[PDB]
Design an enzyme around this catalytic site. Sequence first.
Site, PDB file in Angstrom:
ATOM      1  N   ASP A  84       0.833  -1.199   0.000  1.00  0.00           N
ATOM      2  CA  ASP A  84       0.000   0.000   0.000  1.00  0.00           C
ATOM      3  C   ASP A  84       0.873   1.257   0.000  1.00  0.00           C
ATOM      4  O   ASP A  84       0.492   2.284  -0.563  1.00  0.00           O
ATOM      5  CB  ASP A  84      -0.947   0.018   1.207  1.00  0.00           C
ATOM      6  CG  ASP A  84      -1.887  -1.182   1.234  1.00  0.00           C
ATOM      7  OD1 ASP A  84      -1.435  -2.286   1.609  1.00  0.00           O
ATOM      8  OD2 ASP A  84      -3.074  -1.031   0.870  1.00  0.00           O
ATOM      9  N   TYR A 135      -2.042  -3.764   8.112  1.00  0.00           N
ATOM     10  CA  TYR A 135      -1.120  -4.876   7.926  1.00  0.00           C
ATOM     11  C   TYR A 135      -0.002  -4.890   8.964  1.00  0.00           C
ATOM     12  O   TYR A 135       0.363  -5.951   9.454  1.00  0.00           O
ATOM     13  CB  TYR A 135      -0.537  -4.858   6.516  1.00  0.00           C
ATOM     14  CG  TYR A 135      -1.560  -5.195   5.457  1.00  0.00           C
ATOM     15  CD1 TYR A 135      -2.337  -6.355   5.561  1.00  0.00           C
ATOM     16  CD2 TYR A 135      -1.733  -4.382   4.335  1.00  0.00           C
ATOM     17  CE1 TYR A 135      -3.257  -6.701   4.573  1.00  0.00           C
ATOM     18  CE2 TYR A 135      -2.654  -4.720   3.336  1.00  0.00           C
ATOM     19  CZ  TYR A 135      -3.411  -5.886   3.464  1.00  0.00           C
ATOM     20  OH  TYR A 135      -4.296  -6.256   2.478  1.00  0.00           O
ATOM     21  N   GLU A 146      -9.967  -2.033  -2.554  1.00  0.00           N
ATOM     22  CA  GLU A 146      -9.198  -2.367  -3.752  1.00  0.00           C
ATOM     23  C   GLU A 146     -10.081  -2.485  -4.984  1.00  0.00           C
ATOM     24  O   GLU A 146      -9.731  -1.997  -6.053  1.00  0.00           O
ATOM     25  CB  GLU A 146      -8.419  -3.667  -3.560  1.00  0.00           C
ATOM     26  CG  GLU A 146      -7.299  -3.563  -2.544  1.00  0.00           C
ATOM     27  CD  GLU A 146      -6.473  -2.294  -2.709  1.00  0.00           C
ATOM     28  OE1 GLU A 146      -6.011  -2.027  -3.837  1.00  0.00           O
ATOM     29  OE2 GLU A 146      -6.285  -1.564  -1.710  1.00  0.00           O
TER      30      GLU A 146
HETATM   31 FE   LIG Z   1      -4.768  -0.946  -0.234  1.00  0.00          FE
HETATM   32 FE   LIG Z   2      -5.491   0.138  -3.329  1.00  0.00          FE
END
Ligand SMILES: [Fe+2]
Ligand SMILES: [Fe+2]
Lengths: 281, 281
Positions: free
Chosen positions: B72, B110, B200
Amino acid sequence: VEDEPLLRENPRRFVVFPIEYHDIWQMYKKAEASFWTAEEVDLSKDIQHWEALKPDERHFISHVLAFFAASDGIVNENLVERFSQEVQVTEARCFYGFQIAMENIHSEMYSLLIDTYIKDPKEREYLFNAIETMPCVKKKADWALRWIGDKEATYGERVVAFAAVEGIFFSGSFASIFWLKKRGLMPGLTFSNELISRDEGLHCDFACLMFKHLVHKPAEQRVREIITNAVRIEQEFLTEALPVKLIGMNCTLMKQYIEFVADRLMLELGFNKIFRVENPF
Amino acid sequence: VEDEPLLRENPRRFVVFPIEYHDIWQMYKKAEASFWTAEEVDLSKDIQHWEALKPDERHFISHVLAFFAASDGIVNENLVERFSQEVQVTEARCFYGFQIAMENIHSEMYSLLIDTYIKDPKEREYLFNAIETMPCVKKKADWALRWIGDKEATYGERVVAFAAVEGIFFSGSFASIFWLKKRGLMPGLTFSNELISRDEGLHCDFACLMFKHLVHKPAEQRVREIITNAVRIEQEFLTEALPVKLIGMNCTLMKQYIEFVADRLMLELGFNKIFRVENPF
Ligand SMILES: [Fe+2]
Ligand SMILES: [Fe+2]
Ligand SMILES: [Fe+2]
Ligand SMILES: [Fe+2]
């Protein structure tokens, strides 16, 4: 620029943990927690209030809204093409990423306000393109845009300039709207003004925090000069181009308030106050 | 570039109203409405689940998380230094402003996941710096970074490349986590994976919408080539470098799923399907 912890190359730039600067990170979290959308501002019960206004009170508000219409866009322009690109510290890029998103919400809010109060499309185009029609706001805009295209000015001078844009250029119009709130008027205008101001104060403090993280920054005299020039431009805007007298405010105390805000900015920057005046309001 | 409605100079760029492109604007509103923060994901009841896992299931997940750790960030790097700067249409800059903010939340999520499952600091640095340690993820990263620094590639080719990064490079790991969800495991991991995937899909559709607004874009063969190269790289990652077999998945059907996603991307782009295979899962 390689000796600048904030601007030097950073290989761990793409990952958030572990946190390197907790002061910057906390700023980002405060911003994130402040999230709000334009939809959350009820403007249904405002078209009526706009009518209960005096021809001068509408003249004033519409002109302030004219400046605010593109102002957040200009700020975002700088943050995207400059600040966000230059800074390599993850935490700072996170703050800037959120600042950009909130500025766009601010931009929408002001457009929504104008759209809601000025039904006539003729007037609309005149305000929406204020930086291309109203000489008064054209000056505050050029000042900001100059700092964006100025390839000589260091990040230090530039971050100080935009702290002035978001603190000093907002202060006058902000105070004006808070005056109306006291007078019980335009609940839609004053409510959005409270949310936006909360963000600006945050955008300003962050600017000062970035300044502190800069090693080689401009001398104090240069900072006073930039702040002072913004002060004058802001006063000339609210005591000449668009007198706050139009809404029942003393043009003198307004000038003093602007200076009081400039002083707070200086302290936040780590320098002494310039004007040494109390907040009148 | 002056004949490109999306890239040409726009004087009304700083103001939101009136809306020029309602299709782009609606995309932005869908993104804005999808806002969420990492804090909203409960990971308290996950350290236990991570233990109830088999040595291979942890090996797999930790490696997928290694790729997601900086991914990202890389995307945001491109959006800040490129896309957001190039595009002059207000509505598009608004979408990109929000994409940047959400990518940073994804990035935090994450890191939070890794931090929560891998208590040992030794392992952490190995995953956090996966683009500098794990050759397998190093390849998917270089592919993306190349498109960022490539000064020859047109916006058309570049927007197609990142649509592939966000659609095709995410698809494999996404499907893997959704497989675990079915198997009732890691509620923290699968829940965040649902929110992220929703973003996404949105980032991918927008990429396709920007492609449609481009007048002079790459030929179909070139698009098939870029998409196809991403497909292979993604398959090689999940059937060689890190076999989905480790979590009880057929390496063959996974390759077919990747192609199915590549086909959906092609249709969204306005072209014919490349592989013509059904979604196995
Ligand atoms: Fe993302
Ligand atoms: Fe993205
Ligand atoms: Fe703002
Ligand atoms: Fe601001």
